[PDB]
Design an enzyme around this catalytic site. Structure first.
Site, PDB file in Angstrom:
ATOM      1  CB  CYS A 171      -1.193 -19.103   0.387  1.00 41.33           C
ATOM      2  SG  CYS A 171      -0.227 -18.303   1.422  1.00 41.33           S
ATOM      3  CG  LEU A 172       4.344 -22.438  -0.098  1.00 41.61           C
ATOM      4  CD1 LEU A 172       5.810 -22.045  -0.156  1.00 41.61           C
ATOM      5  CD2 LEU A 172       4.257 -24.004  -0.039  1.00 41.61           C
ATOM      6  N   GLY A 173       1.806 -20.191   3.021  1.00 43.16           N
ATOM      7  CA  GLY A 173       1.740 -19.990   4.568  1.00 43.16           C
ATOM      8  C   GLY A 173       0.076 -19.905   5.040  1.00 43.16           C
TER       9      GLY A 173
ATOM     10  NE  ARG B 147      -2.144  -1.319   3.587  1.00 43.35           N
ATOM     11  CZ  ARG B 147      -1.299  -2.556   3.892  1.00 43.35           C
ATOM     12  NH1 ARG B 147      -1.510  -3.910   3.315  1.00 43.35           N
ATOM     13  NH2 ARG B 147      -0.525  -2.524   5.152  1.00 43.35           N
TER      14      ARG B 147
ATOM     15  CG  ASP C 214       0.877  -5.714   4.862  1.00 46.21           C
ATOM     16  OD1 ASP C 214       0.462  -5.790   3.425  1.00 46.21           O
ATOM     17  OD2 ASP C 214       0.521  -5.134   5.573  1.00 46.21           O
ATOM     18  CB  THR C 215      -1.112 -11.856   4.390  1.00 45.79           C
ATOM     19  OG1 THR C 215      -0.128 -12.499   5.437  1.00 45.79           O
ATOM     20  CG2 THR C 215      -0.333 -11.520   3.093  1.00 45.79           C
TER      21      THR C 215
HETATM   22  C1  HEM Z   1      -4.473 -14.063   5.234  1.00 46.54           C
HETATM   23  C2  HEM Z   1      -3.521 -14.776   4.781  1.00 46.54           C
HETATM   24  C3  HEM Z   1      -2.799 -14.727   3.604  1.00 46.54           C
HETATM   25  C4  HEM Z   1      -3.293 -14.601   2.388  1.00 46.54           C
HETATM   26  C5  HEM Z   1      -4.723 -14.036   1.981  1.00 46.54           C
HETATM   27  C6  HEM Z   1      -2.110 -14.890   1.371  1.00 46.54           C
HETATM   28  C7  HEM Z   1      -2.323 -14.642  -0.028  1.00 46.54           C
HETATM   29  C8  HEM Z   1      -1.331 -15.170  -0.929  1.00 46.54           C
HETATM   30  C9  HEM Z   1      -1.771 -15.143  -2.307  1.00 46.54           C
HETATM   31  C10 HEM Z   1      -2.836 -14.658  -2.877  1.00 46.54           C
HETATM   32  C11 HEM Z   1      -0.498 -15.853  -2.917  1.00 46.54           C
HETATM   33  C12 HEM Z   1      -0.070 -16.074  -4.459  1.00 46.54           C
HETATM   34  C13 HEM Z   1       0.388 -14.949  -5.192  1.00 46.54           C
HETATM   35  C14 HEM Z   1       0.577 -15.225  -6.712  1.00 46.54           C
HETATM   36  O1  HEM Z   1       0.000 -15.802  -7.337  1.00 46.54           O
HETATM   37  O2  HEM Z   1       1.030 -14.043  -7.169  1.00 46.54           O
HETATM   38  C15 HEM Z   1       0.252 -16.310  -1.752  1.00 46.54           C
HETATM   39  C16 HEM Z   1       1.634 -16.688  -1.956  1.00 46.54           C
HETATM   40  C17 HEM Z   1       2.347 -16.911  -0.916  1.00 46.54           C
HETATM   41  N1  HEM Z   1       2.036 -16.863   0.381  1.00 46.54           N
HETATM   42 FE1  HEM Z   1       0.375 -16.376   1.167  1.00 46.54          FE
HETATM   43  N2  HEM Z   1      -1.318 -15.130   2.136  1.00 46.54           N
HETATM   44  C18 HEM Z   1      -1.297 -15.268   3.384  1.00 46.54           C
HETATM   45  C19 HEM Z   1      -0.678 -15.538   4.352  1.00 46.54           C
HETATM   46  C20 HEM Z   1       0.728 -15.960   4.034  1.00 46.54           C
HETATM   47  C21 HEM Z   1       1.751 -16.407   5.383  1.00 46.54           C
HETATM   48  C22 HEM Z   1       1.329 -16.287   6.785  1.00 46.54           C
HETATM   49  C23 HEM Z   1       2.687 -16.501   4.741  1.00 46.54           C
HETATM   50  C24 HEM Z   1       4.172 -17.060   5.277  1.00 46.54           C
HETATM   51  C25 HEM Z   1       4.797 -16.227   6.144  1.00 46.54           C
HETATM   52  C26 HEM Z   1       2.611 -16.272   3.492  1.00 46.54           C
HETATM   53  C27 HEM Z   1       3.735 -16.747   2.624  1.00 46.54           C
HETATM   54  C28 HEM Z   1       3.374 -16.990   0.953  1.00 46.54           C
HETATM   55  C29 HEM Z   1       4.256 -17.593   0.106  1.00 46.54           C
HETATM   56  C30 HEM Z   1       5.741 -18.051   0.600  1.00 46.54           C
HETATM   57  C31 HEM Z   1       3.902 -17.588  -1.221  1.00 46.54           C
HETATM   58  C32 HEM Z   1       4.271 -17.913  -2.547  1.00 46.54           C
HETATM   59  C33 HEM Z   1       4.229 -19.285  -3.051  1.00 46.54           C
HETATM   60  C34 HEM Z   1       4.713 -19.711  -4.512  1.00 46.54           C
HETATM   61  O3  HEM Z   1       4.815 -18.447  -5.154  1.00 46.54           O
HETATM   62  O4  HEM Z   1       4.967 -20.913  -4.642  1.00 46.54           O
HETATM   63  N3  HEM Z   1       1.548 -15.915   2.965  1.00 46.54           N
HETATM   64  N4  HEM Z   1      -0.153 -15.770  -0.822  1.00 46.54           N
HETATM   65  C1  LIG Z   2       0.295 -11.580  -0.718  1.00 47.97           C
HETATM   66  C2  LIG Z   2       1.152 -11.767  -1.922  1.00 47.97           C
HETATM   67  C3  LIG Z   2       0.438 -11.287  -2.935  1.00 47.97           C
HETATM   68  C4  LIG Z   2       2.023 -13.087  -1.819  1.00 47.97           C
HETATM   69  C5  LIG Z   2       2.909 -13.042  -2.710  1.00 47.97           C
HETATM   70  C6  LIG Z   2       3.751 -11.516  -2.724  1.00 47.97           C
HETATM   71  C7  LIG Z   2       2.630 -10.813  -1.533  1.00 47.97           C
HETATM   72  C8  LIG Z   2       2.434  -9.506  -1.579  1.00 47.97           C
HETATM   73  C9  LIG Z   2       3.243 -11.449  -0.285  1.00 47.97           C
HETATM   74  C10 LIG Z   2       2.810 -12.970  -0.399  1.00 47.97           C
END
Ligand code: HEM
Ligand SMILES: CC1(C)[C@H]2CC[C@]1(C)CC2
Length: 405
Positions: free
Chosen positions: A348-350, A177, A242-243
């Protein structure tokens, strides 16, 4: 600031949506974006803001585009282009089959088995923060819980100093943001300045933290480079910080305004998991994209090589073709359809981490503080961007209706 329409863009597909400042932000962030799904908007539109880019509006198209890495590349996943350009996180800026090795590594750090190990702490911290707030009859949920909770857990996972929170959080914010205070590259460099030394140190004297596990990992039979680790961790930080932080605020804002939803969870706790999903659908908050690798005709629209397209993960679950009465929260929908955690190879891995944090918070907050509302005369402001947010959430409650546990 609208950029001149490119030659290949039919003027009837223009719809000037500003992802950073949508029109009726006042109504709510998801409501602001949902204007893209009104009858007057074609499925795929071109916006002139933020330099010009496509936006797919429907779940069907967002998913297809996400499945299709051949045409829609992650090389430049952020809008505006300079951001997508400066963006070099792993595995996010990669396509399969390269992506797959880096993912297997990040999975080691955040996957299921890590969550299971951390379960007790998550619960410990939630209970502690909540109990600490309870007697006050008032907080700033965003600063009081939504930030500390997810953030301390991450700092713990990563083995980093809590003291670094404020500085880190600022930088992470600038990315999703953008404020105007610093450009994406600058912001990227500062986070990177942070990490470098840290990585150096954990390459020499490894710990058990996430950073040590990443710095010393194997990718394709050989060792990860220092640059590759810096780039993986960089991502870990943005998702860490941030998520979850923002999602909780949306959820709690809703809960605060809907007594019957709270009661529902209090009395039939077996519904929490179902409700967590429904909230993930309704208060979805991530919007990123892809870059066209070549000229390609997609659902009758001609896309040109180099064109960026925003594929709002937020949008899928808000789409009426996907969920009847989208804007309505119903904990017992037969089918909760969303792509909140994305779709395709970048899922999403997380996710397991996020879910565990959400479920604990709901269970634990409702246990202790069953009745609460928004502070009289507080006007809740949402913010739009790659990751959407809530500026502040002033809550009030009567201590006398709370339960110590
Ligand atoms: C409300 C919680 C969360 C939401 C809505 C969210 C959403 C997303 C989205 C939409 C993506 C895919 C982005 C793409 O396709 O460009 C993503 C990927 C990713 N997120 Fe999450 N995220 C969340 C929490 C987390 C947490 C807690 C972690 C770990 C610290 C995290 C780590 C990752 C990673 C490592 C990827 C990439 C996986 C890859 O590219 O194979 N996220 N997330
Ligand atoms: C939410 C996301 C879209 C996922 C990949 C980039 C980002 C901004 C952090 C983790």
């Amino acid at each position: 600031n609208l950029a001149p329409l490119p030659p290949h863009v039919p003027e009837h597909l223009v719809f000037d949506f500003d992802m950073y400042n949508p029109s009726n932000l006042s109504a709510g962030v998801q409501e602001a974006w949902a204007v893209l799904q009104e009858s007057n908007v074609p499925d795929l539109v071109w916006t002139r803001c933020n330099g010009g880019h496509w936006i797919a509006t429907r779940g069907q198209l967002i998913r297809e585009a996400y499945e299709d890495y051949r045409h829609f590349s992650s090389e430049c996943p952020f809008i505006p282009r300079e951001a997508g350009e400066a963006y070099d996180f792993i595995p996010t800026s990669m396509d399969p089959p390269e992506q797959r090795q880096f993912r297997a590594l990040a999975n080691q750090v955040v996957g299921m088995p890590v969550v299971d190990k951390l379960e007790n702490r998550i619960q410990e911290l939630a209970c502690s923060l909540i109990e600490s707030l309870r007697p006050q009859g008032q907080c700033n949920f965003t600063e009081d819980y939504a930030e500390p909770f997810p953030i301390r857990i991450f700092m713990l996972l990563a083995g980093l100093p809590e003291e670094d929170i404020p500085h880190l959080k600022y930088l992470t914010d600038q990315m999703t943001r953008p404020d105007g205070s610093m450009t994406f590259a600058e912001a990227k460099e500062a986070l990177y300045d942070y990490l470098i030394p840290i990585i150096e140190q954990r390459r020499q004297k490894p710990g058990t933290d996430a950073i040590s596990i990443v710095a010393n990992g194997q990718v394709n039979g050989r060792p990860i480079t220092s640059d590759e680790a810096k780039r993986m961790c960089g991502l870990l930080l943005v998702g860490g910080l941030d998520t979850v932080v923002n999602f909780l605020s949306f959820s709690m804002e809703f809960l605060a305004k809907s007594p019957e939803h709270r009661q529902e969870l209090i009395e039939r706790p077996e519904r929490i998991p179902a409700a967590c999903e429904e909230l993930l659908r309704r208060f979805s908050l991530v919007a990123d994209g892809r870059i066209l690798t070549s000229d390609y005709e997609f659902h009758g629209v001609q896309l040109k090589k180099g064109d960026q397209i925003l594929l709002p993960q937020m949008l899928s679950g808000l789409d009426e073709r996907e969920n009847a009465c989208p804007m309505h929260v119903d904990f017992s929908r037969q089918k909760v359809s969303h792509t909140t955690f994305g779709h395709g190879s970048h899922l999403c891995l997380g996710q397991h981490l996020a879910r565990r944090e959400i479920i604990v918070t709901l269970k634990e907050w409702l246990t202790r503080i069953p009745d609460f509302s928004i502070a009289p005369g507080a006007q809740i402001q949402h913010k739009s961007g790659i990751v959407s947010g809530v500026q502040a959430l002033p809550l009030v409650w009567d201590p006398a209706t709370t339960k110590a546990v």
